[PDB]
Write a protein that binds this ligand. Structure first.
Ligand SMILES: O=C(O)Cc1c[nH]c2ccccc12
Ligand SMILES: O=C(O)Cc1c[nH]c2ccccc12
Lengths: 104, 106
């Protein structure tokens, strides 16, 4: 069970995360998101984000086989399992929107 | 061409994929879906790293925190500070100046 120490540190990390999220929100409103994201994310991390969008899209579409996900997107079985679990755990508003925007 | 066709084709596919992510997140913010989208797209440790990198950038721009404090408070050793400082130097000055206004506002 978490202690006051661990709870304090977790809340501090949460606030730091929200500060990043808000900084990026504002960057988008001032057309500075692209250079901000180049500063805050390494190239391989940006590549991972682009690929993960594809994985999510293709999991929702349901047409690509597991072998095709691996060959085309580099997503092996464990990554598909994790990604599927993230989708299942996402709030309904996010899943509905992703279906609307990624499969349109 | 700057790159051979194999490398160029893969780079342009990655670029298109990146822009798709950027646009998706742009719209998520507008729809108040940014938090769940980022929880889907980033692992917990990756989210923590982004929170910490904001603090490193802030403290590098502020100039007050020492090298030892950067390591002991923010996990940033000498090499990481050098890398981060290099990213700031490479960024457009417009971004740097905006970061100073936002992050050092107080
Ligand atoms: O260089 C790294 O290890 C990751 C990284 C990406 N953007 C940064 C900004 C400040 C400090 C570290 C990083
Ligand atoms: O599970 C991972 O290794 C990384 C990851 C985070 N969000 C994802 C969405 C889809 C596929 C993989 C990931």
């Amino acid at each position: 069970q978490q202690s006051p120490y661990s709870a304090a540190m977790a809340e501090q990390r949460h606030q730091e995360w929200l500060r990043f999220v808000d900084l990026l929100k504002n960057a988008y409103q001032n057309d500075l998101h692209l250079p901000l994201l180049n500063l805050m994310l390494l190239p391989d991390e940006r590549e991972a984000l682009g690929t993960r969008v594809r994985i999510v899209e293709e999991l929702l579409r349901g047409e690509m086989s597991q072998r095709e996900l691996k060959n085309e997107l580099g997503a092996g079985i464990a990554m598909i399992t994790r990604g599927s679990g993230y989708l299942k755990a996402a709030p309904v508003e996010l899943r509905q929107w992703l279906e609307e925007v990624l499969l349109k």
